[PDB]
């Protein structure tokens, strides 16, 4: 199974520099190009460069020279994109993607860069409670994107609807709703586990009646 | 730089039915067109590759034709689980460039939001904030407004609104609005109702709750 | 499509001379993608030029490649005898790898008119199916030519191939064989076949015809 | 020092499969893609696909997406196309192609140019099987006569595969002689003429014989060409 493992989030301050990577496995990362790919949030995609183990090369868009610089570590299997002197705009969601050779077949999860002056800031995850009942979690004022919301572990995967975050003073703030029958809660535990990994923050908070 | 021009933008089909997007280049680039979906929080999946190919794994109801600067991709028998966006790509030189993109949505039967309003919380409220939560889910066309009423007036400021995207099972909308005010503007009002007009009901669906409970 | 256009189709020059070969593609080629090969009779192509400016391990200087965009030139300051073969252009910077048609380097030399001959089906040839009739143009310059053929003044279309020698290696003339073929049938049914001529050296076409 | 080393001729029936190759000896193979080209006779080259040495992954031509296929075997340094559902128009010479040494860039493309071709392979497409030929005589008369010059020859018709050498007097005849190429026809068979000019005066006391060999059918043929 063909998988390529980015890098968490990353914050950084305008006119510094970021460096993610990209491990690959299931392959050999040396035998294939690696392409770099740029999706700014609700906009298209944009070809960044690649990398080509075999004969040590690279490539550039235009666009990103001076801005991207692509390199490797043929011993970890591991291919690396930093960006230097950002800005607000090269805020985005950066993909690595395997070339075949230059379309691009298997892609990376995704790593998200946000250029600002704010500093992190965890969520405050605070319980929404009242034939099928439905309970919710709010995530507010936390920084920056993104945040990941589960309930139960997982096990509660449908009847559930998690909302894209709204920006206000520098802050996100989320919402996930999860239905239910009237049986299991409150009869049963219904907890929402959320996730901020740029905080390294990981909160359950089990929600209750009144 | 070889220009990918992508269309429509956005599309509604129903189920059976069949979808058809395009993607004209400013140059010939042989038949080097690649198909991507793209579902929301995940990266693009390839569908279809250089030649026409449609990838292992994927479906028998996509597929693609064309040459030189006009392509073309189309899904037969369309689900409710084809509700994505789609990117056409051109591998054939330098810079390799995407489309615009085609956000493909479903055509369904109306349906009612199924609203639930929550009171704030003893947490917040020890913080020093409050935050009156409504549900609107599941609701179908996207169009939809939210009226909030404090003790019978409508109020409009301070509301965060945020939609998802078409669920892939029954291709239905929800909606959560945020109504966040001061603790002690929270504690001088005792109604709170949230009103979800749709064209489901000319009558609003209505779910209020009073701060004596 | 793209399309690379290769100007003049053939190029007639003598050794020592400057030889300038045009190539204009239907679309900009990006970082200067273009390619020259030769291809000497009978054998494969070789590089010449790559980038459109840079000579390839092994090639003499006085081959030179310029150009971009839209327009690129192969150019050779003094042509040596091996130099006179086919060339044609490439652009890589597409998926395509679109070639030209080719410019053929000959010897330039003065005009030759054609030496026309008919030759009539062979009695012996009867007895299969068909019947070959064979027309002669020998020893002329230009290769440029035109074979027409008539029977009863009908001019015959899709059934008569043609085949040429290459340019003579000691009077630089060319030769082409025109051969008609008809069935036993179609043969002995008609009278008159003509072999009619076009060429520079010639004022007006001539004809050869003869009948059964 | 790069060689390329292509398999031999072949000869398919219309609608059969035939598959190329071509063997990379004075480098390393992986390191270097492999392009196809074709080229009919007297017509242009024409790009097929290039194949990844390192790691297969290929790229076609639209004009024959659906029918060409390269592989490649890297153990013995060799690539491979295949190209199914011949048609007439398919015969032509078949050449692989080394790219050039990788010398930087942006695009993947700065070095895709042909940079080391081989020899060729010829692929021809008929449903005919060996065959010897049929010798006609031209016979020289009025209408083959210009001044004190007469034309006489012999037409070398329906054989396959070719060559077939043509002389006159057992090689004792060189002057004046134009042997032209081999024609194929729309029945598939090989079709030439050998035509030979000669003093007309010197007609009636001349022998003139032409002398066709034809190995691949294991025929000689001579035939005297007389004026009737
Ligand atoms: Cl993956
Ligand atoms: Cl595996
Ligand atoms: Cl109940
Ligand atoms: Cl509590
Ligand atoms: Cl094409
Ligand atoms: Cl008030
Ligand atoms: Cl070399
Ligand atoms: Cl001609
Ligand atoms: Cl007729
Ligand atoms: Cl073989
Ligand atoms: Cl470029
Ligand atoms: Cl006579
Ligand atoms: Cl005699
Ligand atoms: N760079
Ligand atoms: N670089
Ligand atoms: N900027
Ligand atoms: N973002
Ligand atoms: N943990
Ligand atoms: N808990
Ligand atoms: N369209
Ligand atoms: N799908
Ligand atoms: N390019
Ligand atoms: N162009
Ligand atoms: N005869
Ligand atoms: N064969
Ligand atoms: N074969
Ligand atoms: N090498
Ligand atoms: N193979
Ligand atoms: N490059
Ligand atoms: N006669
Ligand atoms: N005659």
């Known amino acids: 199974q063909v998988q390529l493992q980015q890098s968490g989030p990353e914050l950084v301050k305008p006119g510094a520099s970021v460096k993610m990577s990209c491990k690959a496995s299931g392959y050999t990362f040396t035998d294939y190009y690696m392409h770099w790919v740029k999706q700014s949030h609700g906009k298209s995609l944009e070809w960044i460069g690649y990398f080509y183990p075999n004969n040590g090369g690279d490539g550039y868009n235009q666009k990103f020279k001076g801005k991207a610089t692509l390199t490797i570590d043929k011993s970890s299997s591991t291919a690396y994109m930093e960006l230097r002197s950002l800005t607000s705009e090269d805020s985005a969601v950066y993909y690595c993607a395997r070339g075949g050779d230059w379309y691009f077949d298997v892609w990376g999860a995704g790593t998200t860069v946000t250029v600002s002056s704010a500093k992190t800031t965890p969520p405050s995850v605070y319980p929404l409670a009242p034939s099928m009942v439905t309970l919710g979690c709010l995530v507010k004022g936390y920084f920056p994107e993104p945040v990941t919301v589960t309930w139960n572990s997982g096990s509660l995967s449908s009847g559930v609807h998690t909302f894209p975050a709204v920006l206000e003073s520098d802050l996100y703030t989320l919402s996930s709703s999860v239905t239910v029958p009237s049986s299991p809660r409150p009869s049963e535990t219904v907890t929402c586990n959320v996730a901020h990994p740029a905080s390294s923050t990981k909160v359950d908070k089990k929600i209750v009646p009144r | 730089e070889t220009t990918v021009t992508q269309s429509p933008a956005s599309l509604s089909m129903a189920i059976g039915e069949k979808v058809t997007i395009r993607c004209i280049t400013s140059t010939d680039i042989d038949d080097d067109m690649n198909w991507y979906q793209q579902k929301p929080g995940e990266p693009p999946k390839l569908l279809i590759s250089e030649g026409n190919t449609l990838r292992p794994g994927v479906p028998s109801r996509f597929s693609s034709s064309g040459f030189d600067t006009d392509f073309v991709f189309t899904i037969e028998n369309m689900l409710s689980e084809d509700a994505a966006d789609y990117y056409c790509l051109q591998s054939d030189n330098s810079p390799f460039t995407f489309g615009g993109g085609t956000k493909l949505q479903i055509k369904r039967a109306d349906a009612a939001p199924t609203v639930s309003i929550f009171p704030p919380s003893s947490e917040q409220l020890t913080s020093g904030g409050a935050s009156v939560v409504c549900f609107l889910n599941n609701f179908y066309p996207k169009d939809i407004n939210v009226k909030w009423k404090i003790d019978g007036s409508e109020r409009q400021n301070g509301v965060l609104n945020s939609w998802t995207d078409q669920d892939s099972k029954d291709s239905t909308y929800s909606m959560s609005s945020t109504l966040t005010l001061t603790k002690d503007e929270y504690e001088r009002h005792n109604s709170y109702t949230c009103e979800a007009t749709h064209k489901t009901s000319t009558s609003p669906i209505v779910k209020s709750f009073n701060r004596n409970e | 499509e793209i399309v690379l256009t290769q100007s003049p189709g053939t190029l007639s020059l003598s050794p020592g001379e400057r030889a300038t070969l045009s190539c204009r593609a239907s679309?900009?080629?990006?970082?200067?993608?273009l390619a020259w090969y030769q291809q000497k009779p009978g054998q494969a192509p070789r590089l010449l030029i790559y980038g459109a400016s840079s000579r390839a391990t092994g090639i003499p200087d006085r081959f030179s490649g310029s150009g971009s965009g839209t327009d690129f030139t192969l150019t050779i300051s003094r042509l040596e005898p091996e130099d006179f073969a086919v060339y044609y252009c490439?652009?890589?910077?597409?998926?395509?790898?679109?070639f030209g048609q080719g410019t053929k380097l000959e010897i330039k030399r003065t005009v030759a008119a054609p030496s026309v001959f008919i030759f009539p089906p062979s009695d012996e040839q009867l007895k299969s199916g068909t019947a070959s009739v064979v027309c002669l143009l020998n020893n002329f310059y230009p290769r440029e030519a035109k074979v027409q053929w008539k029977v009863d003044n009908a001019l015959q279309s899709g059934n008569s191939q043609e085949s040429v020698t290459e340019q003579d290696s000691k009077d630089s003339t060319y030769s082409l064989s025109s051969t008609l073929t008809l069935s036993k049938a179609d043969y002995e049914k008609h009278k008159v076949y003509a072999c009619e001529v076009t060429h520079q050296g010639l004022s007006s076409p001539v004809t050869k015809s003869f009948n059964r | 020092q790069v060689q390329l080393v292509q398999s031999g001729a072949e000869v398919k029936k219309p609608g059969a499969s035939v598959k190329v190759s071509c063997k990379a000896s004075?480098?390393?193979?992986?390191?270097?893609?492999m392009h196809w080209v074709r080229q009919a006779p007297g017509q242009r080259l024409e790009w097929m696909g290039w194949?990844?040495?390192?790691?297969?992954?290929?790229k076609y031509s639209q004009k024959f997406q659906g029918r060409v296929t390269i592989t490649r075997d890297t153990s013995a340094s060799t690539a491979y196309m295949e190209l199914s559902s011949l048609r007439s128009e398919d015969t032509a010479v078949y050449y692989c192609?080394?790219?050039?040494?990788?010398?930087?860039?942006?695009?993947?493309?700065?070095?895709?140019?042909?940079?080391?071709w081989g020899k060729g392979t010829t692929v021809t497409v008929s449903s005919a099987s060996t065959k010897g030929p049929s010798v006609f005589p031209l016979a020289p008369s009025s209408k083959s006569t210009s001044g004190g010059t007469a034309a006489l020859g012999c037409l070398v018709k329906d054989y396959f595969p070719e060559p077939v050498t043509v002389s006159w007097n057992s090689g004792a005849l060189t002057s004046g002689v134009h042997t032209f190429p081999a024609v194929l026809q729309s029945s598939g068979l090989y079709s030439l003429s050998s035509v030979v000019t000669v003093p007309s005066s010197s007609l009636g006391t001349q022998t003139y014989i032409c002398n066709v060999n034809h190995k691949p059918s294991n025929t000689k043929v001579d035939k005297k060409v007389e004026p009737k």
């Open positions: 192609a080394r790219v050039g040494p990788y010398c930087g860039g942006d695009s993947p493309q700065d070095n895709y140019y042909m940079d080391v």
């Open positions: 194949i990844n040495a390192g790691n297969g992954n290929t």
């Open positions: 004075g480098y390393t193979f992986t390191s270097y893609a």
């Open positions: 679309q900009s080629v990006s970082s200067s993608y």
């Open positions: 490439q652009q890589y910077g597409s998926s395509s790898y679109t």
